[PDB]
Write a protein that binds this ligand. Sequence first.
Ligand SMILES: Nc1nc2c(ncn2[C@@H]2O[C@H](COP(=O)(O)OP(=O)(O)NP(=O)(O)O)[C@@H](O)[C@H]2O)c(=O)[nH]1
Ligand SMILES: O=[N+]([O-])c1ccc(NNC(=S)Nc2ccc(F)cc2)c([N+](=O)[O-])c1
Ligand SMILES: [Mg+2]
Length: 166
Amino acid sequence: MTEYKLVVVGAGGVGKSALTIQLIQNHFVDEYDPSIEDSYRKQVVIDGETCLLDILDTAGQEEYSAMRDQYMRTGEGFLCVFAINNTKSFEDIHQYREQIKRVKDSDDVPMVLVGNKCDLAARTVESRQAQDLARSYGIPYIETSAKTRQGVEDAFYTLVREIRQH
Ligand SMILES: Nc1nc2c(ncn2[C@@H]2O[C@H](COP(=O)(O)OP(=O)(O)NP(=O)(O)O)[C@@H](O)[C@H]2O)c(=O)[nH]1
Ligand SMILES: O=[N+]([O-])c1ccc(NNC(=S)Nc2ccc(F)cc2)c([N+](=O)[O-])c1
Ligand SMILES: [Mg+2]
């Protein structure tokens, strides 16, 4: 078993927290203990190798950059999740990556680009806009929904495959 520190990033209101709990308990965030590190570690078997999946969910808002620089250096990979319905979130995914490359000191880092909010009926950033961006970064692009719960784990599982290969 290996400790996999998956750094979940998005913007603050994309649904990263909701998508996280899904891979943990597979339930919609109804009751939790805030004012602390919303991280959850689960044991799974990926690539024929049982390992731990420590999912760290930082705070999208509030001042705490000092915490970020630490999470990037403590995490083995980063997950970029944004809501297609929110064109603003799509922008954060760009500046967010700039931080990973800096801390990691490399343009090619193990990460994944997931598109939360796929069940909604008001998509602003079509998958094409996200695909052209992810494909340009050399990372995979997956779509999930924290509400309907579609391919939620499929997105996370991608991270493990990224780190393993990178
Ligand atoms: N319809 C839909 N709603 C979502 C999805 N993901 C998150 N939401 C909801 O949209 C709202 C986002 O709230 P926001 O403050 O941005 O997230 P937060 O800071 O974690 N607070 P909360 O835990 O309530 O989300 C919440 O009700 C959240 O549960 C999604 O994929 N689809
Ligand atoms: O940059 N900071 O302000 C800062 C950095 C690190 C730490 N603690 N050290 C660590 S390893 N914290 C930590 C480490 C791993 C996690 F998943 C969550 C938190 C702390 N801290 O207050 O314990 C603060
Ligand atoms: Mg939440």
